[PDB]
Amino acid sequence: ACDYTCGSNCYSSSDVSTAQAAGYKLHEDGETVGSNSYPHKYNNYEGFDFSVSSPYYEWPILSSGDVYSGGSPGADRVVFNENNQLAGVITHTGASGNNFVECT
Ligand SMILES: [Zn+2]
């Protein structure tokens, strides 16, 4: 079973934990990867009910299970805050333009 489902992509809690670890470490190092410079700030204009406080940061989680290293980020993201707490798993899949919907 999938702990999070983004469109047709399935992720386990281990895939989320691995992606968050890598994105939080670049945050601590003041570094980014990719054309679109991840991790970068996430603003909750859609009003998702995250129970952790901002600032929030978004980082790609890949369907392949590999940690994002630059290259196409795909449509899925883990969102974490400044204290390295998981906020949620969201996706551009099924949302117009640059908006997002939450993974279920
Ligand atoms: Zn996996």
Resolution of the experimentally solved model in angstroms: 1.8
Residue 48 CA to residue 61 CA, distance in Å, equals 18
User: Which residue type does 62 have?
Assistant: L
Tokens 């890949």 locate to 62
Nearest CA-CA partner of 39 in 80, 74, 96, 4: 80
Supply φ then ψ for residue 87, to 5 degrees: -95, -50
- Number of structural domains, the chain? 1
Active-site residues, by number, are: 40, 58, 92
* Structural domain containing residue 71: 1-104
Residues with CB under 5 A from ligand 1 (ion): 15, 65
Q: Write the DSSP symbol of residue 42.
A: E
CA 11 – ligand 1 centroid, Å: 5
| Technique that determined the structure | X-ray
Distance from the alpha carbon of residue 13 to the mean position of ligand 1, in angstroms: 9
CATH of the domain at 46: 3.10.450.30
- In the reported structure, the alpha carbon of residue 27 is separated from the centroid of ligand 1 by a whole-number distance in angstroms of 23
